[PDB]
Nucleic acid binder design. Structure first.
Ligand code: NA
Length: 91
DNA sequence: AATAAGCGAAGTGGG
DNA sequence: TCCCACTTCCGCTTA
């Protein structure tokens, strides 16, 4: 199945949930979730994965934090904001 | 307090 | 066997 970082990058490229997620500086790979509309995007991730339970933004962000060490996605010190690596953006 | 974002041991999937 | 890539659960911290 698709990886979480790829699901997010694909959404940003397609624009299909523009009210839930958006680029901040696409050249730098920085993006931000909507405070009010991020849960709908989390729900979509869980359904795409076929997980047993309903996915929540909290659980999705718990997965996102695990990318910090390997580098695919890092948290930015701004509300709801993260940054893809150059390697992820290049692929 | 109420609300929200952010943080970081065991269970599940598919190798 | 034992890692992948999360998922789920739980408790805590900061604003
Ligand atoms: Na939140």
């Amino acid at each position: 199945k698709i990886r979480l970082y790829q699901f997010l990058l694909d959404l940003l490229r397609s624009g299909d949930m523009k009210d839930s997620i958006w680029w901040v500086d696409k050249d730098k790979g920085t993006f931000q979730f909507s405070s009010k509309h991020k849960e709908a995007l989390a729900h979509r991730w869980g359904i795409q994965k076929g997980n047993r339970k309903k996915m929540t933004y909290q659980k999705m962000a718990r997965a996102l934090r695990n990318y910090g060490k390997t580098g695919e996605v890092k948290k930015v010190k701004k509300k709801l904001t993260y940054q893809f690596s150059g390697e992820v953006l290049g692929r």
